[PDB]
Amino acid sequence: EMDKFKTLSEKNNITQKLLQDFNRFLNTTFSFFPPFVSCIQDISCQHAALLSLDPAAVSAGCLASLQQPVGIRLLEEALLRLLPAELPAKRVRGKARLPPDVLRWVELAKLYRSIGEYDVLRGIFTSEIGTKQITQSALLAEARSDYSEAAKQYDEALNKQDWVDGEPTEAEKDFWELASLDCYNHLAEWKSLEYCSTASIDSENPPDLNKIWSEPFYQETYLPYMIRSKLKLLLQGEADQSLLTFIDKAMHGELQKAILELHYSQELSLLYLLQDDVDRAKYYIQNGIQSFMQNYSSIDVLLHQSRLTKLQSVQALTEIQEFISFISKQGNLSSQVPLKRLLNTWTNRYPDAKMDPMNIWDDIITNRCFFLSKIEEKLTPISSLIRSCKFSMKMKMIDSARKQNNFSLAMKLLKELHKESKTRDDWLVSWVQSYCRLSHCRSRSQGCSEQVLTVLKTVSLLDENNVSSYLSKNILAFRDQNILLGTTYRIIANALSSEPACLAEIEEDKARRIVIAGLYQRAFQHLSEAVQAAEEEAQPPSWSCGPAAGVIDAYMTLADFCDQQLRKEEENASVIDSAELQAYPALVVEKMLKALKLNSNEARLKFPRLLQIIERYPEETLSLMTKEISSVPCWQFISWISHMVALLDKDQAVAVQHSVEEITDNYPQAIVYPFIISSESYSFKDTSTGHKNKEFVARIKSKLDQGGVIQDFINALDQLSNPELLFKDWSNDVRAELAKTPVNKKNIEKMYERMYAALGDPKAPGLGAFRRKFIQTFGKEFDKHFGKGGSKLLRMKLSDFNDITNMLLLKMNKDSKPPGNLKECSPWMSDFKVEFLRNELEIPGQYDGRGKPLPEYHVRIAGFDERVTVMASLRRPKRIIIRGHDEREHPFLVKGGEDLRQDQRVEQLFQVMNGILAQDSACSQRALQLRTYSVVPMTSRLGLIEWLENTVTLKDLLLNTMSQEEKAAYLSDPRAPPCEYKDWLTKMSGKHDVGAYMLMYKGANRTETVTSFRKRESKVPADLLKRAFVRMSTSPEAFLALRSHFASSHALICISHWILGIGDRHLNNFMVAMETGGVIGIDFGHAFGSATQFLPVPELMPFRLTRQFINLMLPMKETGLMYSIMVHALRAFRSDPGLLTNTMDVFVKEPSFDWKNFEQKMLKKGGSWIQEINVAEKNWYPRQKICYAKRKLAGANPAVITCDELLLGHEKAPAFRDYVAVARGSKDHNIRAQEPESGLSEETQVKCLMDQATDPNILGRTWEGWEPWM
User: Fold this and answer.
1) Whose CB has fewer CB within 10 Å in the chain, the N or C terminal residue?
2) Region annotation Activation loop: residue ranges?
3) Three-class HEC string of 660-697
4) Are 1098 and 1263 in contact (CB under 8 A)?
């Protein structure tokens, strides 16, 4: 309306009121969520401080819900004109940055706390120097000290050393800096809560040092502290400050307004646990009760914050209503029945154990103490009971830090144990925990020579000397093995081996008995035989303790120990290391009887590879392991099927003795599918490796083929989609064989088999049936052209047809264009039968199951609907309907010109990795998913491929908003600038669309250009990312609620693409699923250093972001905000080496596919991949230097280093020797050079690998089809 009003400036005046009035309106309405919606009205309004006059809790307090950032919303875009450059503008507002700070304080969580922990502490250029530091604590998840030591001096000096940087320190740095410091143990209790709580405020008449405001600038923020502080205090007993002082000043702040007061304290209900109120307990839990009535009623967009918050909440709560209510009726019976029972105690501690978040994981043992207390004091109205309940309370906490892997509060609790139990096993548990606590130090690199002896100081001297023998002498002798894992492992370096500091002397001393000179060679002996010594100390108790208690432990353990030391001997040559190294694996493999009751996929992936390279044990490997999936459920093999399917085919000389055994065992144990793959697999090479081998295995082939008859029925049943790749790919394989030597016979020979089987005889009736309706129509008359010159070619097998195929291809494609008519194919495809109910042969659901135990196909793929469409592609893959047997519905996609046993492996890792997402709680705390897929590889060039919906390229919405905003249909893509950067390309390198990324000089100018161009190109499409992101995004808070998991993608993504290189992604190839509402990568066309090492396609980038990306991702500094996320990827990664070790290990160890046949693949699509493939992999290891380069590549990265090795061996200077040096570039980028550490790089590795990509220098190089330029 103010639009029609020429009056505008005065409208501004109107706003002034509007705003202000609404800011009061904040300042006045409270405990009112419908105004939570109002704040959102307010951000929907159009102005800047339109909000800002709303500070954070001013939006609303401890609960605004996630309207929380929404003010922040306009903040960055428009309110912020200053910070939008991603760096502090001293003229920017503490009322701009800060309000985010304070607000996300109630987003306090891993990511948020990581977010703000430095976040606009970039927005303060003062904060940086100490702030970036102390971030690590919360990154280490330090609620205790390592910060308090790290940052405490910042405000604590009153910035003595700090202020001298420059006049800015200001207040929010100090505000946040302080409230920072205290809030840590404010969650973590202990005395720093009392100490720092004191550091906040006088505890000298708080009540109105509290009521001191109706607008806390802070003060409500300290509000919890001392009433928080009580808790460590409430541990022992009663009679302190907050007891009466707060009990009353809530009888006065009570007289202020009751609700939100309550909402801030059931600290109110908390203290009660001391004084045994039968009454204010009653009503004031009722207040906790109506309270979370508010909570869940106040919430939407269901989230850990929306929830886990409320979860810890209701947990502790009704834990109390327990506690109370049986203080209420504990008298009613008898007197006291729990005197005879108390196991209400069991009923209390068992029911809620310790989930991922550790706030709760304290809150519990708090409550517990408060109860076991009341127990023993109500024992009067016996103690072996409640004491036993103390052991109870403690142990779960103990081991459940052993999950949390967190140092400080642990030993807080370990000392707490030495106090608490003081038993014979008080220690032994203190021990076991301390032991793991090392491995929590072993987690990081810091503590190099240190923690190792530190607790290893305490090793066998006092441990089992405290036992009875004593089941779980298992778990301790184990703990040893843990140790020598550490003491061993600190040499991936010779870190210890080069460090004889003070102790390491003593280490070598004990070493022979359980300097660096003996540690040098003979530590590994000491480590080894005190480990395995502990293994025979532990072996019977592995069987004794509990199902999957210690067997998995000791056994997977020493297994790992070995295979690691194997990897050593893969690198280094020690004959005796091979002697016991190859003596031992005999033991650990067999455990799958005991073992193989969990995934332990280490075991399963190792075991084949063992013989695969080497077998010293003729039947042993065959005896017991042959008993494996023979014995253990049919399903138990499935995860490594791909292995066997080539392994049994091309690899195995031991097939008949072993693999043939189990597989032929597991068909009658209901394995059915292996046909398809084998169908595919045994398709290429029938195994000529050995006589007997091919004989009995080929026998297997024949045995299992029957009933795979109907598979084959799916085979021919899919000549789908369009032959046009049958033809063209025939031109490519055939015409490709024209570059060979003599012996052209087999070459085009099988190509003929499957040509005049597939195509050249379309009307051939046998073909005709399996010929499709597309072929029935247009796959004939031009196939008459093709059968003639193709009959000559059928007669010749000489290279001339390279030109004739030039004709042929042009012919064979150009007359194939109009078809793909979609339910022409489908009714032809409407065979699929279902008579004698498909003749009584049970069928997968199309590749049923991911490798979790017992047959995961109880379903039959059954019918199909003719509904299908292709994504326009080089594939044009048909997306077809799988209609269900058991009343399931399963449509999917197809890949017919290509067949992927490689991306098989690809997910075959993914499943592992997110397997580790499981291994870490905090991953769950980040809700770390996996995009997956599936494939039904029946034969050589093709297999069915899974499909999933609501899923379309980001590029889509990007564009529709692009064009239909930018003019109408144009996008912006016909801008001059794109073709103009192409012009600079042509000026500094060749003229053509293939190369001209060759020459590539002027690295400073490289930066110059790619900046200049890049930015004027790329800003508006960011508005589209956020924008169509909006037309997706229903509610304002839903927006970034979305980019939670969206970013979660781009992170986990970029991780994967370091795990191996990116291809099969333009920018589009990641595609939103609307329910998660975020793109996924399903697309994998490339890996490792080969692809990038292609002179056509050099790519240094460890991943691909773009300008618009980071823009969307925020006016942040998502640098951090996804950075440390990446870290968690790594802190994950550093958990167990052997995982991916085996993964990529046997992974690249196996294939003849992934190189020459993947040469064939890159062929099968990649254009400049044309000659690259063959003349590339020749005389070169995708294997063993890739073996090591990848194995190290795990460990640390001085800047994409082993790639630089690869492309280094590659050619030539102008692209490479130029940029790999120019990867190191100006003091602009010089960080990228100097920052790296060959010795150790991790959170680093992140740091660089992130904006390695940011480098316009790196950017304008890579390629256009990836459009960082756009």
Assistant:
1) N
2) 1081-1106
3) HHHHHHHCCCCCCCCHHHHHHHHHHCCCCCCHHHHHHH
4) no
End-to-end CA distance of the chain: 38
DSSP SS3 for 208: helix
Q: Are 39 and 71 in contact (CB under 8 A)?
A: yes
Let me know: does 39 contact 55? Beta carbons within 8 Å. no
Residues after which the chain is broken (C–N above 2.5 A) are: 381, 514
Provide the token pair at 956.
Answer: 């889509």
Q: Tell me the CA distances in angstroms from 932 to 962, 966, 1219, one per residue in order.
A: 30, 35, 35
Give the H or E element holding residue 939.
strand 935-939
Task: Give the rounded distance of the alpha carbon of 954 from its chain centre.
Answer: 21
Number of H helices and E strands in the chain, helices first, is 65, 8
Residues in the chain: 1270
CA distances from 35 to 39, 47, 255 (A): 6, 19, 24
Residues contacting 1071, CB < 8 A, separation 6+: 951, 952, 953, 954, 1079, 1080, 1082
Going from the C-alpha of 42 to that of each of 39, 67, 84, the distances in angstroms are 5, 11, 21
Nearest-5° Cα angle at 103, 100 to 109: 105
Position 469, amino acid: S
Q: Is 944 strand, coil or helix?
A: strand
Q: Starting at the earlier edge strand, list the strands of the sheet with 893-895.
A: 893-895, 942-945, 935-939
Reply yes or no: is the peptide bond before residue 335 cis, omega within 30 of 0.
Answer: yes
Q: Do residues 1101 and 1225 touch, judged by C-beta distance below 8 A?
A: no
What is the residue-wise DSSP string for 234-301?
A: HTT---SHHHHHHHHHTTTHHHH-SHHHHHH-SHHHHHHHHH--SSHHHHHHHHHHHHHHHHHHT--S
Q: Are 234 and 366 in contact (CB under 8 A)?
A: yes
Rounded alpha-carbon distances, angstroms, from residue 1005 to 449, 489, 1016, 1269: 46, 45, 17, 15
* β-strands 935-939, 942-945 pairing: antiparallel
Closest to 172 (Cα-Cα) out of 93, 238, 234: 93
Rounded distance, CA 131 to CA 234, Å? Answer: 33
Tokens of 1269: 């330029």
Q: Which of 173, 110, 107 is nearest to 143 (CA)?
A: 110
Count of other CB atoms within 10 angstroms of residue 568: 16
For 1079, the enclosing helix (H) or strand (E) is strand 1078-1081
Residue 1106 identity (one-letter amino acid): T
Tokens of 80: 């912020």
Check: CB of residue 1098 under 8 Å from CB of residue 1223: no
Strand runs labelled E in 669-769: none
Contact 542, 550 (CB under 8 A): yes
Sign (positive or negative) of CA dihedral 15, 17, 22, 27: positive
Q: Which residues in 787-888 belong to E strands, given as ranges? A: 869-870, 878-879
Find, among 429, 503, 523, the residue nearest to 470 by Cα.
429
Q: Which amino acid is located at 755 in the chain? A: M
Angle at 813 between CA 809 and CA 815, to 5 degrees: 125
354/344 Cα distance (integer angstroms): 18
For residue 823, the one-letter residue type is K
Distance CA 84, CA 82 (A): 5
Cα(320)–Cα(336) distance, integer angstroms: 19
Question: Encoding tokens for residue 1084?
Answer: 């994998």
Virtual CA dihedral for 257, 259, 265, 269, nearest 10 degrees? 110
CA angle 738/743/748 to nearest 5° reads 50
